[PDB]
Specification:
The structure is cut from a larger assembly and holds four copies of chain A (172 residues).
Chain A: H1 9-35, H2 44-71, H3 91-118, H4 122-152, H5 158-168
The complex binds fe (iii) ion (54 copies) and oxygen atom (16 copies).
PDB class: metal binding protein
Keywords: human L ferritin, HuLf, Fe(III), trinuclear Fe(III) cluster, metal binding protein
Entry title: Crystal structure of human L ferritin (HuLf) Fe(III)-loaded for 30 minutes
Amino acid sequence: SQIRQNYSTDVEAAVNSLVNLYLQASYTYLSLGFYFDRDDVALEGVSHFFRELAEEKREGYERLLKMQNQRGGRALFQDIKKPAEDEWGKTPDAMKAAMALEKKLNQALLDLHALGSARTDPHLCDFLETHFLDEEVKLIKKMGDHLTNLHRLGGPEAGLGEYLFERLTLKH
Amino acid sequence: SQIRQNYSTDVEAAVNSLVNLYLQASYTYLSLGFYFDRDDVALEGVSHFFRELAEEKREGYERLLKMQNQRGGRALFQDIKKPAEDEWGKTPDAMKAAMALEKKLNQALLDLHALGSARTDPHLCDFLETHFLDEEVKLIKKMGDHLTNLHRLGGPEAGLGEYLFERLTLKH
Amino acid sequence: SQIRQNYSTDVEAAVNSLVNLYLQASYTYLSLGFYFDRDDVALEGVSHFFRELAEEKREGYERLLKMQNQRGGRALFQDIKKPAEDEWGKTPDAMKAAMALEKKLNQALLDLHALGSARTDPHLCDFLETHFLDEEVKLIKKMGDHLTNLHRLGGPEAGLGEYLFERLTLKH
Amino acid sequence: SQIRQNYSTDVEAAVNSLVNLYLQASYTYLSLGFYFDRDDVALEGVSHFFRELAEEKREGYERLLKMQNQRGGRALFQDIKKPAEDEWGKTPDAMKAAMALEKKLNQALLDLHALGSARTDPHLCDFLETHFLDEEVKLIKKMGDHLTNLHRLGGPEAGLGEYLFERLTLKH
Ligand SMILES: [Fe+3]
Ligand SMILES: [Fe+3]
Ligand SMILES: [Fe+3]
Ligand SMILES: [Fe+3]
Ligand SMILES: [Fe+3]
Ligand SMILES: [Fe+3]
Ligand SMILES: [Fe+3]
Ligand SMILES: [Fe+3]
Ligand SMILES: [Fe+3]
Ligand SMILES: [Fe+3]
Ligand SMILES: [Fe+3]
Ligand SMILES: [Fe+3]
Ligand SMILES: [Fe+3]
Ligand SMILES: [Fe+3]
Ligand SMILES: [Fe+3]
Ligand SMILES: [Fe+3]
Ligand SMILES: [Fe+3]
Ligand SMILES: [Fe+3]
Ligand SMILES: [Fe+3]
Ligand SMILES: [Fe+3]
Ligand SMILES: [Fe+3]
Ligand SMILES: [Fe+3]
Ligand SMILES: [Fe+3]
Ligand SMILES: [Fe+3]
Ligand SMILES: [Fe+3]
Ligand SMILES: [Fe+3]
Ligand SMILES: [Fe+3]
Ligand SMILES: [Fe+3]
Ligand SMILES: [Fe+3]
Ligand SMILES: [Fe+3]
Ligand SMILES: [Fe+3]
Ligand SMILES: [Fe+3]
Ligand SMILES: [Fe+3]
Ligand SMILES: [Fe+3]
Ligand SMILES: [Fe+3]
Ligand SMILES: [Fe+3]
Ligand SMILES: [Fe+3]
Ligand SMILES: [Fe+3]
Ligand SMILES: [Fe+3]
Ligand SMILES: [Fe+3]
Ligand SMILES: [Fe+3]
Ligand SMILES: [Fe+3]
Ligand SMILES: [Fe+3]
Ligand SMILES: [Fe+3]
Ligand SMILES: [Fe+3]
Ligand SMILES: [Fe+3]
Ligand SMILES: [Fe+3]
Ligand SMILES: [Fe+3]
Ligand SMILES: [Fe+3]
Ligand SMILES: [Fe+3]
Ligand SMILES: [Fe+3]
Ligand SMILES: [Fe+3]
Ligand SMILES: [Fe+3]
Ligand SMILES: [Fe+3]
Ligand SMILES: [O]
Ligand SMILES: [O]
Ligand SMILES: [O]
Ligand SMILES: [O]
Ligand SMILES: [O]
Ligand SMILES: [O]
Ligand SMILES: [O]
Ligand SMILES: [O]
Ligand SMILES: [O]
Ligand SMILES: [O]
Ligand SMILES: [O]
Ligand SMILES: [O]
Ligand SMILES: [O]
Ligand SMILES: [O]
Ligand SMILES: [O]
Ligand SMILES: [O]
């Protein structure tokens, strides 16, 4: 590669691996998104919330593939694993799955930052910090707040709570 | 002081003391404000309500310091006492703490008015009446109304009530 | 905490401690600000300079408290220490106190960066670098330039120099 | 008088007396104003400063005469005493005369407030507080600040200082 400089084979492969993880998370969010528009679930605000996240994850993998080209790495694609569940249950369940998925992406991001730091690759480190890290922290905080409000709305009165949350917090 | 006229040493010191009280109330409101944005509390409308009050209290101390300069008093600063609690509980609790804090400021304002009246200082009296007294009365009334609506929303159904109040009364 | 990830207890406490330092610096700037509007000092441009800095420091503590919530730390408030002097002397003196105060904040910022670097927390490191470090360096440079111009205006002709500096350099 | 209510003969006469004092202060400011435009003094910014004050004093006496009509008092005019000096010296001297004149008006205002308070006439008290008291305090503060800056510009270098003050502080 005529352009490749300070770009380790380890980062390259771990970037490809993070790309597969983003593709998979996107796929998960697509499934959550359509799930909540089923006639027998019908929570459009929740559907929208998840569709948006599918879309932000695709931007993630796209930005990771562009950066691969820019550093002169070579993208390598693997199969994308189907989402972990076929039905997602109620809003609090789905939001807890989404939380767990974002924590795993965040950990993979922190892991890739540590690797790049170890291979003294400050371009890769700051690319991750300016385009991925701050955004994860903001999104996880939002999901925590959502979970707190779903819980304050739970207990016996749960169906009503789910309706109110979708109507008064989520965007439709 | 070349400008000082009809400005008693007692008013001067009591103004400095009221400044410390406003600084402390601001500090309290800052703490309430961030408290309600914790991921495990997550009531943005309540957070905003308290952040706004932190800000109005700062204007209070600023207006009191300007008036000190204008009369030719000398400001004297003391340490600012940390807020009285580290956790503020639920919306009704916090609103009751806020009520109690505004009553204490109002009493200190009325006390300073009586002192200025006693020292025949009509500039100070009307400064307090045009910039502080009317505003306290309006704010305490609002807090009373909030407390009435939180109570009408309380009982067994309390979590839901707190959610509705934050969503349908408070500004976000 | 449902959201807390890669956020050490040490950073958390040192953030709370940096918050107290910003609150205190704000307080110092408030005192400088009113001091320079005393009828017997009367340097409005210097007053304005310090009032602005009080305001930028408050933004600092506010941004630090928001980041605490976002990472899922818990804010803890302590008393705020009164400013170190009651009278600030002439413009060069005050500007030298302000310089010394900014160096201490900068050192505390660098100290917190080193700690976060030691605990491999790149979110915290870059938060500090993008919102605090560059701004300190710019502000200290400005204060150095001010001190150089106050000195070039000093010597026997000092009163006149102070007047000219306030009128021709500072904003009013 | 068909309209007169709660309006004591004492207030009435003291209002007429305060009118004479405002007429006299206006007259003083007229004299200061033209003095500073003499070819051999030639400080246009100082001239303007005093002309403006002549004008604000006339508004004072006009507002006092209107209030006399409104309460159903009867205006009584006396001769207006010529200003106390024919030459006003240098800017600091004139500004000190102006300071002394504003303190005497302020004392007469406070005296009339006390009298109205003694005769339980709250209309007269608040008329004075909303249209006269706050304005005196602001003006005396400004004059103090001017005197501080003239002094910081004084000593051996006095002619230059006077020039700079007129050019860089006063409006022209
Ligand atoms: Fe639909
Ligand atoms: Fe849809
Ligand atoms: Fe979108
Ligand atoms: Fe869309
Ligand atoms: Fe879209
Ligand atoms: Fe993004
Ligand atoms: Fe988007
Ligand atoms: Fe986007
Ligand atoms: Fe987009
Ligand atoms: Fe391109
Ligand atoms: Fe299943
Ligand atoms: Fe970095
Ligand atoms: Fe974005
Ligand atoms: Fe929030
Ligand atoms: Fe907020
Ligand atoms: Fe506001
Ligand atoms: Fe706001
Ligand atoms: Fe604001
Ligand atoms: Fe206010
Ligand atoms: Fe406000
Ligand atoms: Fe306001
Ligand atoms: Fe405001
Ligand atoms: Fe001012
Ligand atoms: Fe406690
Ligand atoms: Fe009053
Ligand atoms: Fe009044
Ligand atoms: Fe207001
Ligand atoms: Fe001023
Ligand atoms: Fe000012
Ligand atoms: Fe500003
Ligand atoms: Fe400003
Ligand atoms: Fe401002
Ligand atoms: Fe800033
Ligand atoms: Fe600013
Ligand atoms: Fe700013
Ligand atoms: Fe600002
Ligand atoms: Fe926020
Ligand atoms: Fe001292
Ligand atoms: Fe860094
Ligand atoms: Fe960086
Ligand atoms: Fe900025
Ligand atoms: Fe002229
Ligand atoms: Fe003229
Ligand atoms: Fe005019
Ligand atoms: Fe004019
Ligand atoms: Fe005019
Ligand atoms: Fe007026
Ligand atoms: Fe005018
Ligand atoms: Fe006017
Ligand atoms: Fe006018
Ligand atoms: Fe009329
Ligand atoms: Fe003479
Ligand atoms: Fe009154
Ligand atoms: Fe006016
Ligand atoms: O939809
Ligand atoms: O979207
Ligand atoms: O996006
Ligand atoms: O984004
Ligand atoms: O927020
Ligand atoms: O605000
Ligand atoms: O405000
Ligand atoms: O206000
Ligand atoms: O000011
Ligand atoms: O400002
Ligand atoms: O700011
Ligand atoms: O800033
Ligand atoms: O003039
Ligand atoms: O004027
Ligand atoms: O005026
Ligand atoms: O005025």
